[PDB]
Every structure is written in C-alpha cells, then in structure tokens.
C-alpha cells in the first residue's frame, strides 16, 4: 500500500507580457497635431 | 501661380498624412488595448488553472489515501 | 460516508476580446491611394 | 528651376510616404489577423477546458459515489 | 522668398513624418514581440496542459482499475 | 465491473499563429531613412 503523493504540479514559467506603446501613440498624435505648424501660408 | 499649386497640394498632402497618422494612432491604441486584455486573460487563466489543478490534485490524494485506508 | 459532490467549477469570466481596426486599415489604404491626387504636376 | 526641384522632391517624398502607409496598412492587417486568431484560440481553449474539467469532475463524483457504496 | 518658406516648411514636415514613421516602426516592433511572446505562451500552455491532463487521466485509470480490483 | 478506460482526450486543434511583419517594419525604417534624400536644398 502507501500510495505515493501523486502531485500533478503547477503550470510554472507560463506568463504573457504586456505591450506599452503609449509613448509611440502619444508621439504619433503629437506629430499629427504639430503638422498644422508645417502648412504653407503664402 | 505654380507656387499656389505647390502650396495647395502640399497642404492637401499634409492633411491626408495627418488623417493617416491619426488613424494609425487609433489602430495602435485599439491593438494595444486588445493585446493587453488578452494577456491579462491568459494570465488569469493560468492562475485559475493552477488553482483548479491544485484542487484536483487535492481531491485525488484524498481519494488515494482513503483507498489505501480501504486496503 | 456520503461524500459531498466535489464540483471543481468552471473557468468563468475568462474571455478574449477581438480587434476591429478594419476601418483604420481601410482609411490608411484610401489615403495611400488618394495621395496620388496630391502629386505636383507643373 | 528650384520649382522643378521642389516639385520633384515633393513627389519623391509623397511616393515614399505612400509606400510607408501601404506597409503600415499591411502590418496592421497581419497583426489584426493574428491577434484575432489567438483570441479565438484562447476562447476555444477556455471552452474545451470547461468541457474537459466538467468530464473530470463527473468521473470524480462517480469515483467518490461508488467508493461510498464500497464503504 | 516664398520658396524659402515652401522649402523650410516641407523640410519641417518631412522631419516630423520621419519621426512619426520611426515611432510607428518601434510600436509595430513592440507589438510583434509581445504578440509572438503571448503566442508562444499560449502554445506552451496548451502543450503542458496536454501533458498534465495525460497524467491526470493516467492516475484516474489507475484508480478505476485498482478499484475494480477491490470490487 | 470492468470499468471502461475513461480517456479525457487532448486539446487538439488549438494553436496560436505568429506575426511576421518584420518586412513591413524594415520597410518603414528604410523609408524613414530614405526621406532624408527628399529634403529640399535650394
């Protein structure tokens, strides 16, 4: 008898990262707004 | 005259590029939101799965132990 | 005896969203095509 | 003369920006396809996992019940 | 004079669009890295889950078999 | 007796794709570098 403790374990080392491109989106919107200071007014 | 032409078409191009950059910013923002949401979903799934397999293991050892008690 | 019904449960509240940026991709392609109407022809 | 220069270099810039916008559109389209596919994959995984854990629970209660019958 | 104006503002616009394209490239690169990493994570999760459910099934059949031996 | 082999099965048909937009990012950086050959030098 004396069956061993059958431990299945754990899903270790599995984890998803996270995008942080807020700086780039802010830069894109800032450039889209600043391009109004590049229009030609003869 | 060609100066009015160059200026007007440059202003048209800059307006179209402003629209394109705003569209790219909106698209990247939506993609970021959804990728982060799916990442949080996968993380909570792995956590809840760890807990669920823990419970499964626990009832399993209870089964084996009380079986050994039977035998 | 009378072991309780050990219900593990269900993975509730877990669900992945879906990107719908088809409008933005269509806008990008439309602008890439409309920029031909902004070329200078002296 | 400098008008031909401004026009030609503006046309070059607009062509390059057209290429860049087409590349950004293709990249966002591929990213959208893959993110949606991984989302559908995660969803079908959570569904099939719900079913699998349901079956596991079921055989577990069968085990406990027929064990109680033994005891 | 207006030629200096057109040239200077075109150069400003091209610099801003260069910055925007570099930002879009960096954003798409980060998004690609994270989407591929989450894809690899989901794949290794489905693999490790297949193995874990295999082990669970195995101990389950051992349980049922030695139970039948008891009965 | 003779309990059947209760096989749970396997999570088949579940697999995540992989983005390969390296060509597009390379094109974007190449254009951001080549736009310096489009600046006006009167």
Numbering used by the authors:
A (entry chain D), C (entry chain F), F (entry chain E): 1159 to 1200
B (entry chain A), D (entry chain C), E (entry chain B): 918 to 988
Article passage:
Vaccines and therapeutics targeting the critical viral spike glycoprotein (S) must accommodate the mutations in S. Even the highly conserved region that plays a critical role in membrane fusion exhibits up to three mutations in the HR1 region of Omicron variants. To reduce the public health threat of Omicron and future emerging variants, we and others have proposed development of antivirals targeting the relatively conserved heptad repeat 1 and 2 (HR1 and HR2) regions of the spike glycoprotein (S) that drive membrane fusion by the formation of the HR1HR2 postfusion bundle. Although the ~130 residues of the HR1 and HR2 regions are conserved in all prior SARS-CoV-2 variants, a few mutations have reached fixation with Omicron in the HR1 region (Q954H and N969K for all Omicron subvariants, and, additionally, L981F for BA.1).
We thus determined the cryo-EM structure of the HR1HR2 bundle with the N969K mutation alone. The long sidechain of K969 is closely packed with F970 of a neighboring HR1 strand, which limits the possible rotamers of the K969 sidechain. The N969K mutant structure revealed a similar HR2 backbone displacement as observed in the Omicron HR1HR2 structure with all three mutations —the average Cα atom rmsd for residues 1,162 to 1,170 is 0.7 Å between the N969K structure and the Omicron structure, 2.3 Å between the N969K structure and the Wuhan structure, and 2.4 Å between the Omicron variant structure and the Wuhan strain structure. This suggests that N969K alone is the major cause for the conformational change of HR2 in the postfusion bundle structure of Omicron. The comparison with the Omicron and Wuhan postfusion bundle structures illustrates structural rearrangement of HR2 to accommodate the long lysine sidechain at position 969. The lysine would clash into the HR2 backbone if it were in the conformation of the Wuhan strain. Thus, the N969K mutation results in a major deflection of the HR2 backbone away from its Wuhan variant position to avoid steric clashes. First, we identified the Omicron N969K mutation as the primary cause of the structural change in the Omicron HR1HR2 postfusion bundle, the sidechain of which displaces the HR2 backbone in its N-terminal extended region. Upon the inspection of the N696K mutant structure, we predicted that the insertion of an additional residue in HR2 near the Omicron HR1 K969 residue might better accommodate the K969 mutation, thus promoting a more stable interface between HR1 and HR2.
